[PDB]
Design a protein around this ligand. Structure first.
Ligand SMILES: *[C@@H]1O[C@H](CO)[C@@H](O)[C@H](O)[C@H]1NC(C)=O
Ligand SMILES: *[C@@H]1O[C@H](CO)[C@@H](O)[C@H](O)[C@H]1NC(C)=O
Ligand SMILES: *[C@@H]1O[C@H](CO)[C@@H](O)[C@H](O)[C@@H]1O
Ligand SMILES: [Ca+2]
Ligand SMILES: [Ca+2]
Lengths: 413, 319
């Protein structure tokens, strides 16, 4: 029969966290739902208000002679007045009635529209990008002007983006592979048998990888977003799974410590086709089968709307593609890049030392991320039949099979 | 309630003192922005930005058992006085991100498929058996951007928390079902803005293929001499599902299909250009709405526990 969402009992509640003015509760997921039963939508934990059972400790975490900004954030005095968006929000106008001097002197430099997005959060579940933990509109008083980028225009590189180098690389891989076959035979009162069979196989693989450089994030002196540091300040300090999962679900299990920008296209045709016949009379019989799979798939990512969706389908069809259609799509990757692949750093590496209780939060995050990877596992689900495998999705385990066996568990043929 | 040193709001909210003067509608109908005209200090230092129409509707309510208002309990007019921004690579326009939405990533990611599997078998002796299974699929995705939204520090519409302050402490099933349809049964904590199609050909190929068309020719005519297939009555049984875009281009694609004719590649790109106006959600990750009920609510855990007792009854209220 079909399969429903299931969970443990809830655990015993927390004490009241005196400065956070809340209490916390949590529960384990045990079945997601499957085979089109009752799909999960169900939470890992819950929180309740309390008048706290003890005093809160002194909140302020002041860095000293550094300027304490209107954000959660400290900054060094060379950046108190710098003609720039220092310290994570504008916080300076009442001081900077003098000393306007910019990082870039007499110049007109623009922001790198790639570097602002560098250091995506990533969730290891599905490997979706999330907006940066990193500030990337902070420049540390450095001008650090790059003339780089294929559109021959200068930009200012933001402090956390240690490298952004436009290594252009364009690759195409193409493979075709056919094997094609036929076998046939033949052999008052009379006898005969006639036999024939034919097989056709094609595998095409194509991929085109187009780079727009690579970013490497800085491994010391990282300046983080006001929202992220605040979302680390507002933590239980006691390993409440559901509350830590709420931070993973807004900034990722990892961040891309370095990532490769650009675009990709990929195409497959697989065709695998067979027909078999026998006929005979012996002093009538006539016995046949046909088996075909035909599956063509196209992926395009990166570039602008028009060119990508043109090229996506032109390439899927029989069409002999115009080189200038490729040039347009591949040029538009300048305007609209996508993250091709990247190196992942566990997110707790961005819990800054020189914040209160930092190392306790890190060991909690390290445990919590391990739990977040465990109770979302596929290994708990019931088995697929025949040649399929257990796919995982939010609130369902399932399988599907382009192989003449059928249903949401591939059980029938 | 009192907001301490910060400002108390009409229809019930607390706005941090630095927000009030900024231009950002912090307390609804610009009622934050009674006189501060000596210090009207903006969130953005004269930088050009236009508000994100895709994301202003993000965080739609959804119900498995009689569909929800497709509307936001979240207040996507709120920005915490930040200027943080995501931009359209297609028109090179910057948008502010509503502070509910933890991430916008505009990601041009088209995918497409065409597929058939077919089996036939016959055994005959003048025991016997005969079998068919056949289909043709065309499937497509158009993807405009990911959204993901907060699980804490959420700022709701005042009209949503009002609809919690009006709930009784008791289970009151009729009133709790009124709320659970007034805003939603569940919310997408994340989703995928775009458009989608599925155009299954229920046509068994032999229905035409006994007349002068080959398998490679009918595939050629779909995406041809050997008959005039576009003139002929022969193509009939094609389904249409089509999600998002401007109704003209959705109609043109449907009209061509119900006429038994192929859509031109010109058409699909025209449709894909129009998903910028009128997006739909291709997939969603779901949580029940009680997770939005603020921890400050005067019987908060009791109301949330009764919303769980109410959500549980919808599954029995319908077959
Ligand atoms: C028998 O022969 C006919 C004529 O070629 C063929 O169409 C059919 O598939 C064969 N199989 C049967 C009738 O079992
Ligand atoms: C096939 O018939 C249609 C009318 O249904 C006609 O417009 C078309 O010209 C014929 N063949 C061609 C040229 O497509
Ligand atoms: C944990 O589950 C218990 C059921 O034993 C409830 O009382 C509570 O609301 C929480 O969900
Ligand atoms: Ca300054
Ligand atoms: Ca305001």
């Amino acid at each position: 029969s079909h399969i429903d969402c299931r969970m443990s009992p809830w655990s015993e509640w927390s004490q009241c966290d005196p400065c956070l003015r809340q209490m916390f509760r949590s529960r384990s997921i045990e079945v997601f739902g499957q085979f089109n039963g009752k799909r999960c939508t169900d939470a890992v934990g819950d929180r309740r208000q309390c008048v706290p059972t003890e005093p809160c400790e002194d909140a302020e975490d002041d860095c000293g002679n550094d300027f304490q900004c209107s954000t959660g954030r400290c900054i060094k005095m060379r950046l108190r007045c710098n003609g720039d968006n220092d310290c994570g929000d504008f916080s300076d106008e009442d001081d900077c009635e003098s000393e306007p001097r910019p990082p870039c002197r007499d110049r007109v430099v623009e922001e790198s529209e790639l570097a602002r997005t560098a250091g995506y959060g990533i969730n290891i579940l599905g490997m979706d990008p999330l907006s940066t933990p990193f500030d990337n509109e902070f420049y540390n008083g450095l001008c650090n002007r790059d003339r780089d980028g294929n559109t021959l225009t200068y930009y200012r590189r933001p402090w956390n983006v240690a490298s952004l180098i436009y290594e252009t690389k364009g690759e195409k891989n193409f493979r075709t592979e056919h094997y094609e076959e036929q076998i046939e035979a033949f052999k008052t009162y009379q006898l005969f048998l006639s036999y024939s069979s034919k097989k056709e196989k094609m595998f095409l693989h194509v991929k085109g990888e187009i780079h727009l450089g690579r970013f490497v994030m800085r491994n010391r002196d990282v300046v983080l977003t006001t929202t992220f540091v605040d979302d680390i300040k507002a933590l239980p300090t006691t390993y409440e799974k559901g509350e830590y999962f709420a931070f993973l679900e807004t900034y990722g299990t990892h961040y891309s410590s370095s990532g490769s920008l650009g675009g990709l296209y990929e195409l497959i045709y697989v065709l695998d086709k067979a027909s078999m016949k026998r006929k005979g009379v012996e002093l009538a019989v006539n016995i046949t089968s046909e088996n075909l799979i035909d599956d063509v798939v196209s992926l395009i990512r990166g570039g602008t709307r028009k060119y990508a969706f043109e090229l996506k389908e032109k390439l899927l069809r029989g069409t002999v593609i115009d080189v200038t259609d490729f040039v347009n799509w591949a040029s538009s990757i300048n305007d609209a890049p996508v993250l091709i692949s990247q190196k992942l750093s566990p997110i707790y590496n961005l819990v800054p030392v020189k914040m209160k209780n930092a190392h306790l939060k890190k060991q909690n995050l390290e445990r919590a991320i391990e739990d977040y990877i465990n109770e979302f596992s596929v290994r708990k689900c019931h088995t697929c039949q025949n040649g399929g495998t257990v796919i995982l999705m939010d609130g369902k385990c399932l399988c599907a099979c382009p192989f003449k066996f059928e249903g949401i568990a591939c059980e029938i043929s």
